[PDB]
Design a protein around this nucleic acid. Structure first.
Ligand code: 3CO
Ligand code: 3CO
Lengths: 255, 255
DNA sequence: ATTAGTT
DNA sequence: TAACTAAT
DNA sequence: ATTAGTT
DNA sequence: TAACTAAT
């Protein structure tokens, strides 16, 4: 009854996340970075219609808001099947170029697994849904990610931007990790007898007894939901001795 | 009166050389080297006629002799002007490939000049004419350099080879150096007060006083001629304080 | 007449 | 992955 | 619609 | 010096 007891912990029934303990993130520019406004590319009506639903709900979620910036980058309609079913994808490459770098705190997977004792044979693997959107963007920096939203077949607005850390931003991964490591510190302390592996949106908890593993998973789920994060209950793995994580298959401590 | 007193020392009036103190050189093959016979390329009558004079005189000098080998490499007619005036040039590249390597004893020019004191401001520069031909080839190894000599416009012989170290052989330079260093050892000993720079065919003697420099040049010339070497009196430099050597201009010790 | 070798 | 230069 | 980047 | 693949 996991999905049951932790309603606010799952994306499926907890609703959009929002890391409240985190202060709006400010994105430092390079000393010589000056705004770049690239005009939106033409888009077949089918494509424009394909991404409309998303945009809409994002606006409704206050994740996208109307604005006016000297910045502006194109929006690209991508698909997976033959070519149907589109997804909005913004090309932030020029913004990334003008943004200030930061030290990659994220530990590569291999060494990340190094810190894993055989003593803990029980696993739980969670992955957060829309990890980035849980982190607020400081108003000052929000202008950097604006893009133009039109609709020749429906008058429609103009330029919109993000209010949360966006997809395609070269530092979202690193910025998110740091954030989560900060927010899961208290947990690590309150459960010295557990091993929490953290790699951005991908989490791994390991314990000695399947009993602990479960008690651990609850404290964790309770905490995640509490702090404002949501994990995909769908693709989740709870209390096992064989679990697939970061592309490695964990079996008794193999891979 | 230099050309005068050392007749046997100059190519111009000493005649072909022959290092007698040297034992016929044997060229060691690689463990897996098996003979290669490449058929001669067609040659315009003009070209064949252009190189005839040389060949002839080489045969007359006993430097080229008739033979019959399983080896055989093409002969190429090369020129310098627009394209007239040809010179026989043999392509020994395949033979070099099948010949055993040896340690490059020749010191590169730069470090070669390193061993040169400022105290010696007087220079003499000689260069040997047909350096390689002064070294005899052991009968056993002579077969390696055979090539086919025809003449559709004059019945003519067939296959001929060298009796002396040939041009285009990847080890002639090194083999020659060693030889000359061996033959000029006694001189170095008998004239501790001189500096002899040796780089294959290119020699440089240096002394303190222009007087020594001259006395030195004589002992040297007498020795060269004696041993069987000939220097091009033509392009020679005797007793100077500024002499061009190995591509460096020596002035008071510059370059 | 071929070739080792180099943006 | 598209010739060219020296050099034998 | 562009692009970093790789025999 | 002759395209192509992922990826935003
Ligand atoms: Co070049
Ligand atoms: Co590739």
């Amino acid at each position: 009854t996991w999905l049951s007891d932790f309603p606010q912990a799952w994306a499926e029934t907890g609703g959009m996340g929002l890391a409240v303990r985190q202060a709006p993130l400010i994105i430092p520019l390079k000393a010589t970075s000056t705004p770049v406004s690239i005009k939106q590319y033409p888009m077949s009506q089918e494509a424009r219609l394909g991404i409309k639903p998303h945009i809409q709900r994002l606006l409704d979620q206050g994740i996208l808001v109307p604005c006016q910036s000297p910045w502006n980058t194109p929006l690209l309609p991508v698909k997976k099947p033959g070519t149907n079913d589109y997804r909005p994808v913004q090309d932030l490459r020029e913004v990334n170029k003008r943004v200030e770098d930061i030290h990659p705190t994220v530990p590569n997977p291999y060494n990340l697994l190094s810190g894993l004792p055989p003593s803990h044979q029980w696993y739980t693997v969670l992955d957060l849904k829309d990890a980035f959107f849980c982190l607020r963007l400081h108003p000052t920096s929000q202008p950097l990610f604006a893009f133009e939203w039109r609709d020749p077949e429906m008058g429609i607005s103009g330029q919109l931007t993000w209010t949360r850390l966006p997809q395609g931003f070269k530092n979202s991964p690193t910025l998110f990790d740091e954030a989560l490591h900060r927010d899961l510190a208290d947990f690590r302390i309150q459960h010295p007898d557990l091993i929490l592996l953290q790699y951005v949106d991908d989490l791994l908890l390991a314990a000695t007894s399947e009993l602990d593993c479960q008690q651990g998973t609850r404290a964790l789920l309770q905490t995640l939901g509490n702090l404002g994060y949501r994990a995909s209950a769908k693709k989740a793995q709870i209390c096992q001795k064989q679990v697939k994580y970061l592309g490695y298959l964990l079996k008794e401590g193999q891979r």
